[PDB]
Structures are given as structure tokens and as C-alpha cells.
Amino acid sequence: PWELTILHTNDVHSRLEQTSEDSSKCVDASRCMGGVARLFTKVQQIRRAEPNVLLLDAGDQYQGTIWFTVYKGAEVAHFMNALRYDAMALGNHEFDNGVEGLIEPLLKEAKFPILSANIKAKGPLASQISGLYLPYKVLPVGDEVVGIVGYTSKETPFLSNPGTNLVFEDEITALQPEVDKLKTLNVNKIIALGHSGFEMDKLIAQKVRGVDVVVGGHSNTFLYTGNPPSKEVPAGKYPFIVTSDDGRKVPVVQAYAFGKYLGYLKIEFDERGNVISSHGNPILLDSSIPEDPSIKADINKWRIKLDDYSTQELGKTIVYLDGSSQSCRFRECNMGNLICDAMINNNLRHADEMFWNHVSMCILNGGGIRSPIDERNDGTITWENLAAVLPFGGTFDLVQLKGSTLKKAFEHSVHRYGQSTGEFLQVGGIHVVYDLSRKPGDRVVKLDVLCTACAVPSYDPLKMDEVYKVILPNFLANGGDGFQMIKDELLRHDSGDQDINVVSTYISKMKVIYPAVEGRIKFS
Amino acid sequence: PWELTILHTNDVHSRLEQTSEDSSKCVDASRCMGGVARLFTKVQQIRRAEPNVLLLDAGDQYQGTIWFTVYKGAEVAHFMNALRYDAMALGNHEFDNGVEGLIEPLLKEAKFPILSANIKAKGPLASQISGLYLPYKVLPVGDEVVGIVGYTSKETPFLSNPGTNLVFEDEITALQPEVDKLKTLNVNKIIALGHSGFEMDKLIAQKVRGVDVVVGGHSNTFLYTGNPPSKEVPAGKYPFIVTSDDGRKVPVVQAYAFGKYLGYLKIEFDERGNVISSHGNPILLDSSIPEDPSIKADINKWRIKLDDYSTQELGKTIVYLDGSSQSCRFRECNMGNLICDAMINNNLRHADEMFWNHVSMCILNGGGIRSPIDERNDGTITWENLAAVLPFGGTFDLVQLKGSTLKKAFEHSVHRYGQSTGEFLQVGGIHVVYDLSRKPGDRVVKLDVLCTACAVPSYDPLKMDEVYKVILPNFLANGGDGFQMIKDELLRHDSGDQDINVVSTYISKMKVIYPAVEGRIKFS
């Protein structure tokens, strides 16, 4: 049998430097994990041991820390080139700076192929981008060849800024003829590498005839066989085996997110390219593995410009930005309005006919706002200032919530009001009125929401059965601050941009800000 | 006696082309008035008749039409040079594009001296601007000399964007030593030329010893001796004679605004430079006076770039901009919110310690909103589109109103509600609640206003005795749409920027707009 070792990452999300255990900023360096210098060491070790190795990335390198803010994808090309990745699929966040912000920093500088079979370019863009990403690449590995066919979430236009000259096709429809064709060209070993989420990966494994292994991303899915090595709870075994329509067993793998783990799957193939076995597990990149000194020095050198950036003026406020807990855990606070307005602004996406935008509504727990910003230094606002307000390494995510779930969330916001607890919600696109004399769970007396499927945005009463799009912190999507109803009742949850970056981009765009407290939240 | 003819303009406000009788856009060319080509003809005629002539401008050439929008003061230098002005005082609107927007287009290109004795530069700006404007200029006229000493409203920092490196001193304090000095240098004929308003001009005439004539501006004051030639109602005789503290009779003159009239004052002086007589009257620049063909051709040539500009994209809307009367004369409409938000944004000025900004509140009659803007052409918004919404050639002005006056204005807004009448008010920085079941004059049941002397903008109940700053159309400041209480009770009224330009600048800054109807106005 011919044995291949597939190493893979996904949803690394700009975690170029080692992180704490929960993927936030590293504080105690001796206990940190991940980062590209540590990944380099482990990949180099495995390449000395294993004759036939592919290192694959399943997309979403872009977006997540100050690295992406400042270097805009140049750091992705540079460090993935240093790690000698063999191929990468395009993720939704590769479109965050538009097509131009994908072509120039990443597609033109990567030394490895960048893949997606289900993205079609139209208009003048087609000739500009032709060949810069590919539907597939056939790679030599030893005396053999392996075809790698790429795919990208069809939901990308709702999640990122791909423009209107890219069309995202159904993955299975796009994939099948490419896999068909490779088989006719005597490529008998096929890896589907792409960025649509575990549920779609399993459908691809089941329905795309000839795929031998699926390497996926997007859903930050952690799979593990045995007792897991850290805090992530496995969604299933690694690999996760799908029985295909043609009767084969097809391994599906993913490796969580943030560069914390290196996926590692060993596959034996027979001479006709059929998988005869598959085994592996993601490797926790913990502090027992040394950071490669050369990569780490390079990281340190690139960090200088980040340190410079962190104190540079982004824009100005002419008002006090009240992110105090005495305000934000008790009433509407202007820092909460500012952050919710930034959240909506970041989520302006190309709209279908019937919508002005697909989302209008925002909630933000007041316990997530960790500092004011005063008017010292002539109202200058810096990245460092915003990092004190939003210090947790969160993202502002898109969820779908029934109106009845949102009503429960607003009851939870005030269920024990008066104690300075974190669950009190700041809002955008929502007007709520509380009567604190009523029993807990019966305190919300009016709840109006800004329409989306309207030509003129305006407020209507919340409807219990309607499913609303809402932007909120990943902490809340995950049921943080007692918002268990959000986690247990949501219909869809997509991970969005870095919290600090959402706000910094908004301030930079606005230039001079003056957020008011304007009656989005009232009592009585 | 030595006889001097002083010709003067003030507050021309970008009316380079002939206008209708009310100074708005010319429609019927055979009935139009003013414009620089017609002014040229009249000035040339008077210079053939009168040996000793000065042509003076008292400031506020900048701001008022698409000319200023596109040419940013280059048109002012070019056309005032063509008319061979002898001197100009700086007005408040000369600072609308900051100090940089004054130095480069106007101060460096004017062929005549530009004056202000009461503006002092500090910091690095002092050496950058030194000599580009002057406190005074001594001009030869025949065998004689005449000193011209300049002044500018001390309120300029509240009205325009002069920055923080210019200090506006008390006019009388600044003027006196310059006039003192000229007298010691055997300059015995002194004209004070400046831009502080008729009330200050009269104080300068009374108190600045040695001033022989005051030529003023800023208040758009029309003075006339006899039956007036058009619709402007005279505030007093021309000249208006002040008895000075030293016992002399000192003529004060002004010539309305918009280039409609050419001031014309004949002064006889004795050999010691004392005024022995003064007589004159502004000349209505009506269609009996031909437009000079060469100036008019030059105007036509400069107009090409304006015509190009008028259809160019300023920014984009992703919402329908509802400026329909069925919306704006009956309820809150998003086009009214947009325009009020632009009005406040344009009036962000350097703030004293206690304020986030000096003004937060806006009212706009719904009858002043004359068109929607739909989402045809991918949401593009052009100057031409905005000219359909705001077609009257108005400005958005700053007034001071007691709370009791504003309450009356909101009662007037709904006194005959239901008929689609123009007086219904759109708002910013104000939240009003009407109960239309109550008698007319008793329909306002809640009226909250956004604070200014606060670190965090927030709403408090309107107070009847407090005097509020409000931005509103000149039409309302003048008592239009039955708002007689505004005209009769206001404490201060300053003329602001062109209505269309306020909105175009705001849209260009915001790039993509999505104004909502958000409950600024409610019923019941």
C-alpha cells in the first residue's frame, strides 16, 4: 500500500503568534499554544519521519488579529510560504477586503496553489483573475500524483465582501465534473479541500463520486478519537467516516481553528487509489513543542510595525465614550451604541431585491464592554484604546434567532437587574422598554425591531415566530453570560470579524464620532 | 474738496452667475439680476465717469452655489481679479474650507490686498500666513492716499472652520491702534472695511477715532434713501450716519447680499481728510444693465466643469430616500432625518470645555423637502438629484430660540394637521410626541432635546426659559410657513452654508448612507 500523511489547518484566523489556551492573546508565554513558529517545528518533525506528506489549509487564514489589520494578507502569503504549504482552499474571510484584497496580497504572492472549483468570475474580472485561483491542482507526491479539488461556502456573499462579479455555485454540482475529469486523466487519489462547514463536508463525502478524503473548515469543528487533549469538546471521531453513495468509506477531517491544533491523518491507498485505511488525530500545539527560532525571529521583526500601529490615531471622538460598567450594565450607554453601529456597518453586504441590507439588529452584553475611552489627547482613538474596551479576542458573529428567543434574551438581560451583572444588553436596530416592577421573566413591555425587507428602514413590533438575523459577540452565540437560550434555540451561527477590527474600521471610516444615548433602551 | 466714489459688495456668496429677483437660480434670463458679468459693466461705466474710485468687498464671497463647491475659491480670485477689486475684508465663510482652503485658492491668487486687523495667527501657522492677509493697506487714489483697515467677526470660530491657530480679537480693540498709527504716518482718509454685521459696524463708527467711513457686511443689511427699487425692505437710510464719540458724522454702508446690488457712496473730503459730505445708494443690478460679453463668455467656459460635476456620483444610498410629501408632511421621513443629520454634521465646530459641540438640534419644514431620491443606478446620488430635493437656493442657518418659542413652533407644526401643509417639522437632536386628539396649540405632549454642555450626548425635557442653538433653513428663520414666532422671538440668527452643499458634503463623507425612521417623531 501507498501511505500518505495529510497535515492540515483551517480557520487559523490571523493567529500568527502563539495564543493562550482559549486562543486569545498570549499572557504567560511559557503556557501558550499554536502560532506559526511552533507549527513550523511540528511540520518539520513530521516531514523527517513520513516520506509522503501534504500540508493543506482549508481557508480562513484572513481576519482575526492586528496582523491582518496591518498586513492585509501579506503575512499570510509570507508565513504560509515559509511553512511550505502544498495547497490552500479559499474561505469566506479571504474576501473581507474584496477581490482586490485577495488578488494582490495573497494570490499573487503565494508559492502554492489556491483553490476553489465553485467560484466563477464574470465581467472584466474574469480575465483579471483567471488562473490566480484554480478549481484543482494535481500534485506529485513521491512516485504518485494526488488531485486536490477546492470549494468555498456558497454563503460567502452574506459573510464577506466578494463583490458582484463572483458567482458562488453549489459545491456538489461544481465538484463532480472536476473529479470526473481527473479520474479520466488517471488521477486515482482525490482530496476535496474546502471551506463550507462540516455538514457540507459530509454531503460532499457522501455524494461526490471519486472523492477519497474530505479536508474541511468554516464550522471550527473539532473531531477527536479518544480522550481529547484540551478544552475543545469533540463533535465526532477523527476522521469522521461517511459511507458514500457508491459504497466506500470516506474520511472527513477538520482541526478546530486558530492554529491551536495541526490535523494529522494517515491514509493507506491500494494501487488503484482506493482508501484501505485511515487513522489519525489533531495534534495539540502546546508548549512542549518549541517555537522554531528562525520563524519566531521573523515574527518578532514583523511585529515592530504592529507595535507602531497600535498607538497611531485611527480617528477622533468629540464625546466621552462611556464604556463604564456603572453605565453599560444599567442603561443605554453610548459606547454600546457605537459598537453596535460598527457591528451593523461591518455587516453591510450586497442585497437581494427585497432588502436594504440582510441584517439590521445587534445585541452586545454590557459585561463585554471593559473600558471607557476619555477625550485625552485631543480625542484621538488608538487600536490600544479599543483593545482595552474589547480585550477578549472575540468576533462579532451573525446568528438567526426566532423572535420568541430574542424576547427570552431581553428578559434574561434584566432578570436580576440592579447588581451590575454582565448580561444587560446594549443594542442597535432594536428599541426595548422594560418595566422593572413586573416579575422577572415578564419585564419586557415593548420590543420593536428595524425592518430589513423594506425600502425605508423603520421599526415594527417583534414577531414571536419570525426568524431574525442578529449580529452579536461569539461569547453570546455560545451561551455566555447565561444566554443559554441563544445557544440552544439559534437556527444559524456564522463566525464574523475580530471585535476590535470591526470597531477600528468603523471609527477610521467615520473620522470624527459623537455617539449619543438616544432612547434605544427605556424603563417603565 | 477731494471727492471719492466708493463702490462695494458684500456677502456675494458665490452668485457668480445672474440670479432670479430673490437671488435663487436664474430661470427666465431676460428678467435676471446680479452676476459678475453685469457687475463688471456697471463698475466699468462708473470708472469712466468718476476720477477717484475704490471697489471694495466686505467679505463672504465664499459659499453659496455649485461654483464654490467645485472651484473652492479659485473662481473668487479669478473673477474678483477680472473686476479689478481694490481690497477685500475676510468674512466668516472665507474659513469654510479651513485656513488651507483660504491661503491656497484665494490669498495666493488675489491681485488685491485681503484684510483683517483682528485675526492673529499662532504656532507654525503664523510664519506660514504672515503677510498673506494684512491688517490694513494704504492705497494711492489720484494724488491722495486712503487707508483701508480690515476686520472680521469675532464669532467666526462658531460659524466656520478657522482652526485653533487663529485668534479672533475684539474688533474695536484691534482697530484703534492701526488707525492711530496710520494717522501718525499722514494717512488722513480712513475706511474701515469689514465683516461683523451692521450693529458692530455702527459701534466701530462711533468708537474707533479717525475712521471716516465704515463699509460692512455679514448681516445682509439693506440700506436705502428713498423708495427702494426691489423687494428688500431698508433697515435705515444709505448711508446710515453715526455720530462718533469725537463728534464727527460717520457714514456706515452695506449692500444686502448675493451680488444683487452694487453699493455706491460719494464722499467729499476737505484737505485735512475730514468728511464734509456723503451721499449715495446701492444700484440694483437689473436686466437693463447688459452682462459684459467677455466676462459672460468666461463664466460660460468655467460653467462646463460645473455641468460635468452636477451628474457625478457623490456617494451611494442603499435605502430609498423618502422625500415624498405624503411622508414628510405627515410623519418622520428618512430624507428629513438625513438632511437634519447633515445640518448638524456641517455645524461641528471647535468646542469650549463644557460642550461636545455648540449645537445639537435641527428643525426642517417638510414643505422644504421637494423630492425623493430612488435607488436607480445602483444607489448613486448626484448633485442634480440633491438639487431636486432642495431647489430653493436656501442656507441652513444657526439661530438661538427660547424653549417656549420652540414649543410654539412644534404646536404650529401640527396646528392644522392632515392637510399636507408645509409646516410639519422634520428634526434632529429632538424627540417630539404629539397627541392630535388635543386642541390645536395643545398637541405637543413631550419634547426632549439632545444636550450640548455634556460629555455624553443624551436627551432631557425641553426647558421653557433655556435658549437653545438650533440649525434650520433660512426660510424658517425668516418666518416662512407661518413660523412668525421664530422670526419675532429668536435671539440670534446667523446665515450658514448652501442647503445643497451641506447635504452633498455629508453624503460624500459618509460614502454609503442608510437613514432610518427611528421614532424622533411619534403620535399619541
Ligand SMILES: Nc1ncnc2c1ncn2[C@@H]1O[C@H](CO)[C@@H](O)[C@H]1O
Ligand atoms: N470572552 C468574552 N467576551 C465578551 N464578554 C465577556 C467574555 N468573558 C467575560 N465577559 C463578560 O465579563 C463579565 C464578567 O466581568 C461577564 O459577565 C461577561 O459579561
Ligand SMILES: Nc1ncnc2c1ncn2[C@@H]1O[C@H](CO)[C@@H](O)[C@H]1O
Ligand atoms: N424658499 C423656501 N425654502 C424652503 N421651503 C420652501 C421655500 N419656499 C416654499 N417652501 C415650502 O414649500 C411649501 C409649498 O409647497 C411651503 O409650505 C414651504 O414649506
Ligand SMILES: [Ca+2]
Ligand atoms: Ca481514489
Ligand SMILES: [Ca+2]
Ligand atoms: Ca479723516
Ligand SMILES: [Cl-]
Ligand atoms: Cl456545518
Ligand SMILES: [Cl-]
Ligand atoms: Cl448686526
Ligand SMILES: [Zn+2]
Ligand atoms: Zn472561519
Ligand SMILES: [Zn+2]
Ligand atoms: Zn469560514
Ligand SMILES: [Zn+2]
Ligand atoms: Zn454672509
Ligand SMILES: [Zn+2]
Ligand atoms: Zn458673514
